[PDB]
């Protein structure tokens, strides 16, 4: 499975100041950024244009360029119309994209948050407020739903452009998406033994404290933390009574290793 998500974050400080920035991820790899400071959308991979031609990329870019300006004017008009009922500062986030599953199946989504809380999605052929959203959003959403050209464009982008473009990305970016990078591991520290595993890709990994062939139950897996070179970091910890650390080992299984696990012995 691979999820493609286009993430926009817009900040409106007051009448005269706002900014919009976006990033785009395929799975856990970044493919684009679009800075407010930038007139155009920047590539973060050699394959960020997927299989689109220079000309079809420009037209897709053109559409976003018009949308970014339209979006900013629309929110600034909405706040004037509502004023002073809805004060600045305002934060709007949008997450949109599609999940590519087994076979050639896919599902798309477009969710919108306001001040950090999910309020609106696009679903089927229309914009909707989600239950619990403030009721002042109903009227602006009704108005946006009257805009048939926007609705048709959004349905196209969600139902068609997205999975098409991501199929081109998955082909074009194959060598990066299927890359294998090997973890290195190291130990540190009743007390708490820590096994640190860093530099692996892709994300799935198995890390466990072992005595011999027996997995130690009290093993706690930490959160997955990113490195800055598109690899992952994880700690597994085990609280052990003082003395009883001899005979313990950290074991790491990962796709990149073959079936040559890393085994690191405490006190070794």
């Amino acid at each position: 499975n691979y999820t493609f998500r286009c993430l926009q974050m817009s900040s409106f400080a007051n009448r005269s100041w706002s900014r919009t920035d976006s990033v785009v991820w395929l799975g856990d790899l970044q493919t684009h950024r679009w800075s407010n400071d930038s007139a155009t959308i920047s590539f973060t991979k050699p394959w960020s244009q997927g299989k689109l031609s220079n000309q079809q990329w420009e037209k897709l870019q053109h559409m976003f360029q018009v949308y970014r300006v339209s979006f900013t004017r629309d929110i600034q008009e909405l706040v004037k119309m509502m004023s002073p009922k809805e004060d600045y500062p305002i934060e709007i986030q949008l997450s949109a994209g599609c999940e590519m599953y087994p076979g050639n199946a896919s599902e798309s989504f477009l969710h919108v948050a306001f001040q950090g809380k999910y309020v609106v999605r696009f679903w089927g052929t229309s914009w909707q407020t989600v239950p619990g959203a403030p009721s002042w959003l109903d009227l602006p959403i009704k108005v946006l739903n009257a805009d048939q050209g926007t609705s048709a464009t959004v349905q196209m982008l969600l139902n068609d452009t997205c999975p098409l473009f991501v199929r081109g990305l998955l082909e074009a970016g194959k060598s990066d998406l299927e890359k294998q990078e090997k973890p290195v591991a190291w130990l540190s520290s009743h007390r708490q033994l820590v096994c640190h595993v860093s530099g692996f890709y892709p994300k799935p990994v198995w890390v466990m404290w072992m005595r011999g062939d027996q997995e130690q139950q009290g093993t706690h897996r930490g959160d997955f933390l990113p490195n800055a070179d598109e690899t992952w970091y994880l700690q597994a910890t085990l609280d052990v009574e003082a003395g009883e650390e001899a005979g313990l080992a950290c074991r790491v299984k990962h796709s990149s290793l073959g079936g040559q696990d890393i085994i690191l012995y405490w006190g070794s």
């Binding site: 900040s11 640190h196 970091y233």
Partner: protein
Amino acid sequence: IQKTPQIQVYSRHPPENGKPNILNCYVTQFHPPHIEIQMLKNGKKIPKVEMSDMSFSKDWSFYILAHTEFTPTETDTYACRVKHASMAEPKTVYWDRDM
């Protein structure tokens, strides 16, 4: 509502004294997105810090990764200090020397 940043500090390679490495400061779970992050060597701001683009998670909270080259040794401390509207004072997290 504001959400307070969490800060995790950890090294790219096993920290071995005298060996050049990379120190990461991962800052997560915060809102709103305006934030200032510094990395500190002996309590002083480290000049060349690189930052990822800000992004956000499924729950809508923001995150960002800062990183800097560093050489651990047993006479230097390292930290990550964050200033955010959610806190009255900057919050500083020291590298625990192991991570």
